[PDB]
Each structure stands twice: as C-alpha cells, then as structure tokens.
Design an enzyme around this catalytic site. Structure first.
Site, PDB file in Angstrom:
ATOM      1  N   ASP A  59      47.769  45.835  47.969  1.00 55.55           N
ATOM      2  CA  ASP A  59      48.259  46.510  46.768  1.00 55.55           C
ATOM      3  C   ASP A  59      48.018  47.993  46.723  1.00 55.55           C
ATOM      4  O   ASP A  59      48.952  48.780  46.600  1.00 55.55           O
ATOM      5  CB  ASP A  59      47.599  45.928  45.523  1.00 55.55           C
ATOM      6  CG  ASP A  59      48.136  44.561  45.152  1.00 55.55           C
ATOM      7  OD1 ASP A  59      47.801  43.575  45.849  1.00 55.55           O
ATOM      8  OD2 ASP A  59      48.876  44.469  44.142  1.00 55.55           O
TER       9      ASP A  59
ATOM     10  N   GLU B 289      42.664  46.651  46.082  1.00 53.82           N
ATOM     11  CA  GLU B 289      43.622  45.665  45.616  1.00 53.82           C
ATOM     12  C   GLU B 289      43.210  45.251  44.208  1.00 53.82           C
ATOM     13  O   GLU B 289      42.015  45.136  43.926  1.00 53.82           O
ATOM     14  CB  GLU B 289      43.633  44.457  46.551  1.00 53.82           C
ATOM     15  CG  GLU B 289      44.643  43.418  46.162  1.00 53.82           C
ATOM     16  CD  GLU B 289      45.180  42.661  47.352  1.00 53.82           C
ATOM     17  OE1 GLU B 289      44.979  41.428  47.435  1.00 53.82           O
ATOM     18  OE2 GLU B 289      45.821  43.301  48.208  1.00 53.82           O
TER      19      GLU B 289
ATOM     20  N   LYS C 157      44.209  42.522  40.844  1.00 52.37           N
ATOM     21  CA  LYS C 157      44.940  41.378  40.324  1.00 52.37           C
ATOM     22  C   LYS C 157      44.932  41.326  38.801  1.00 52.37           C
ATOM     23  O   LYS C 157      44.005  41.830  38.161  1.00 52.37           O
ATOM     24  CB  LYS C 157      44.404  40.084  40.937  1.00 52.37           C
ATOM     25  CG  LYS C 157      45.077  39.725  42.267  1.00 52.37           C
ATOM     26  CD  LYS C 157      44.846  40.779  43.355  1.00 52.37           C
ATOM     27  CE  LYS C 157      45.966  40.760  44.392  1.00 52.37           C
ATOM     28  NZ  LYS C 157      47.267  41.280  43.851  1.00 52.37           N
TER      29      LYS C 157
END
Lengths: 253, 253
Positions: free
Chosen positions: B75, B95, B97
């Site tokens: 990401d 990254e 989420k």
C-alpha cells in the site's frame, strides 16, 4: 506386508474422504504402525496455547490475546504424538484450498468468474502454526491446492457447444499459485518439505520453516487415496525428527 | 532545530496525506536529514527480485515463478538507501488497513456489517517482504490498522436517535486484531519492532522478523502528522542497523 496402509488408502478413495477426514485415518494408521506411542487427532489450537508456547521460548514473545476464545482451525485437523516427557508434539497439520471453478462439470449474483485472491488468507493459518512450533525442528504443514487457478501445466478443455477452451497455465488472469509460494521460500512445489532447512547468513544459522505446498495443476481434483500417502509421508518424517524424544517409549523391549 | 521534520509532519496532516503519500514525504525527509546517501521511493517489487534475492542466500531457495509479471505491492510504497556497495537496501515498507465501518459518521446489497477476515490476507504481503529481506538484520515493515474491528480499549458511541452503543473491544463478533498478531510473535502492539530479535533454541540462534503492528484502538482514524514520525522512527532505526554498510558514504569528510 503392503496391508493396513493399503486398505486405509483404498477406503479413503472409495468414499472420496474429506481432507479433514483423511487426517483421522492418518492418525488411525500412524498409531497402528508405531503402537507404542499415543496418537491424538484434534481440530483447533486455542490462541492461548500458541502464546504459552511462545513465552516458553522467550518471555518477551507471545503476550497478547484480545478475544479469549480465539483459535487456529486448520481445515484438516492436527495429529500429535506424545513424547517421552508427556507433552504432545505436532506430526501433521493438513489444509486444502479450492480456489478455481472455471472448468469442472459482467458480474452476476456473484462476481465475475476469472480470478480471486482468497488464497492469500493463509496469513493467519500458517504463521500461527509455525509460531506454535517455533521450538521444533520440523514444520509438517501440508497444503493441498485444487482449482482452475492453480494450474502448473497448460490444459485445454472442450465445451458444451464444441469449443475446446485452451487455458494457458501462466495466464495472469487465471494463475493464483504464486501468492502461496512465499510460504516455502521459493522451494519445490509438491515436495515433502517436512524437515527444517537451516540457512546461515553472516555467522548465523537462521531456521526456515516451509509449508509443503502440493497442487494438481492439470485441473483434475484430488485423489483421496493419494492424499493419504502424502500426509503419511509428512507424518513419518515428523516421527523421524521426533525420534530422540520418543526413544525409550519405543524401547519397551 | 525542530524545523524540516516539523514542517513536513504538519503538511502531512494539513492534507490528510495517504499512507502511500506519507512514505514519499518520508523519503523527502530521510534524504534531507542524511544528504550523503541516495534515497529512492518505489512501489512494487517484481516477484523476480525476491527470487534473485533468495538464490543469493541459498541456491535451493527461490526457484519458482509462474506468472512473470507477478509482484508484491505494499500500500504505502517502499523507501530504500544505497549502500556503500551500490545495492539498494530496504528502509521502510508501510501498509495500512481499514477493516471496520460500524461506527464512523440480514445481509443487504452487501453482506451483514458485523465482522470480516479481510485482514488475514496479509499472507502474501509480509511473508514476501520478509523473504526479500532474509539477509538483512531488520524488518522495517509497518502496518497501520484502522477500523471498528481493531479496538484495543472499549468505547461507546452515541447514535442518531439517542442510543449510545457501548462497543466492548473484546467482543468476538467485533475484534479482528488477533488475526494479525502472529505477524509479530505475540510482541507489543504499537511499538517500533524494526530491529531483528535473535532467539536461540537448543544451540541455535534462529532469527525472528516481526512486523510493527500499530492501531488506533479507540475507533478514531489515523492522524497523518503522527503517521509521519512513526514511519520516520522505523526508518531511522533501519539506517541505524545499515550503519556499517553505509559508513564511508557518510565519511565524505
């Protein structure tokens, strides 16, 4: 002599035994073959156990549990032996995935049927187990891939109305086998990687734990009879490594 | 002296910079701070590289590639330094989420909104990176969890029509933080675990690589200004470990 392990394997196929069901038979045989030890099949590891196991390795490890009843539940259960010291050691953890469904006998009610990443989830299920076994010298983790996403070779399938769809295994849109590979360090697919390979970089021998990833890359589904020996090969090698900690229980005479 | 790293952090927040966007700024600063080295931000690692890297460690490793253009795409990109020997070393892989959406301002068109396992996917994204860095002595992998599934403490939210929903962090139906934990060996959530901790079991010092898992367990979303320092702490420690291989490039005078 090709008896008990024969009749079991047949029975597996003759009922198209589930991956979970096979492991039970595998314990049934694992016992029958080395009947000095006590084998046990279970199907979940309480998230606790992992931690208990981790603190045992290092106090600073395994110190977090947010939802008490949390557990790792591998599709095909677990088979364990009882070592000379009364503890239980891991012998077989099997799991099988079926990502595919593009070949066997605009999105609709369900998505477009072309590719998916459902297999990437094995985030949890492996890392958790390898951690639970961070103090063992083997990783009997077996994964059985099956589907129109895990093709090794190319195959062409005929259709209802004449067309003979020619599916190229390495088509981007259809191959998901590569998302699982990191789970074995790029090592050979379809191979009994039960024994831990100790690599060493700069005076250090760091231990690798690889999951033996198997796959029927022709598209055809898994033949239970074979799923038996496979798991049985992993199993045996697990007892091969747990030998020294089993010794006297074997030396009953 | 609290200047450049100040103005950048402000700009991050003053634009609610994306996790990927932050890493660029982080390189911008990483450079500005140690302007002797050459920093580079990229956003994908070709599945090849991992293998090339793995063979370098061991010939028997990294020998499988089914879909050539396969790659790991974290990401928030990657930041790398150029070591004394002209290679590029990993400094930051971020990254983030967002599994949640039960609190902020029968299934329907979409599923029932209660719990999901979308986070388990980090199967691929971490294992791949840690493998790509199997020969490094650090794992600057940073994960930023955000959502009504990653609550550390309990919080109660008022509703449109008076009701003050009291969400217990450890409710089974709503906590998914435990699926990510195996990624750090049960170690402290929200902590800069950039430096590899060498455990040793039975005369063996096996190396652990843990991903620094961060989370805003109050339900409130990530404050970009902070996402900057965090990543910057990981970064710095990456240069802290890559010190010996950077030495002379620093000794230009």
């Amino acid at each position: 002599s090709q008896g008990v392990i024969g009749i079991f394997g047949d029975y597996a196929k003759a009922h198209d035994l589930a991956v979970g069901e096979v492991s039970k038979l595998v314990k049934k045989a694992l016992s029958n073959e080395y009947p000095q030890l006590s084998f046990r099949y279970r199907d979940s590891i309480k998230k606790t156990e992992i931690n208990e196991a981790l603190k045992k390795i290092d106090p600073d490890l395994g110190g977090t549990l947010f939802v008490s009843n949390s557990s790792i539940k591998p599709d095909g259960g677990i088979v364990e032996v009882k070592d000379d010291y009364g503890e239980w050691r891991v012998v077989l953890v099997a799991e099988a995935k079926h990502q595919g469904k593009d070949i066997i006998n605009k999105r609709g009610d369900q998505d477009l049927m072309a590719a998916g990443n459902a297999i990437e989830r094995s985030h949890k299920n492996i890392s958790e187990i390898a951690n639970f076994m961070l103090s063992e010298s083997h990783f009997p983790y077996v994964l059985f891939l099956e589907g129109s996403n895990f093709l090794t070779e190319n195959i062409s399938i005929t259709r209802p109305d004449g067309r003979v769809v020619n599916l190229e295994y390495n088509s981007g849109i259809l191959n998901r086998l590569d998302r699982l590979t990191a789970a074995n360090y790029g090592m050979p697919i379809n191979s009994n990687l039960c024994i831990n390979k100790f690599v060493n970089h700069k005076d250090k021998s760091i231990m690798l734990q690889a999951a033996s990833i198997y796959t029927q890359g022709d598209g055809r589904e898994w033949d239970s009879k074979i799923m038996f020996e496979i798991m049985f090969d992993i199993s045996t090698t697990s007892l091969r490594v747990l030998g020294r900690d089993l010794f006297e229980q074997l030396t009953s005479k």
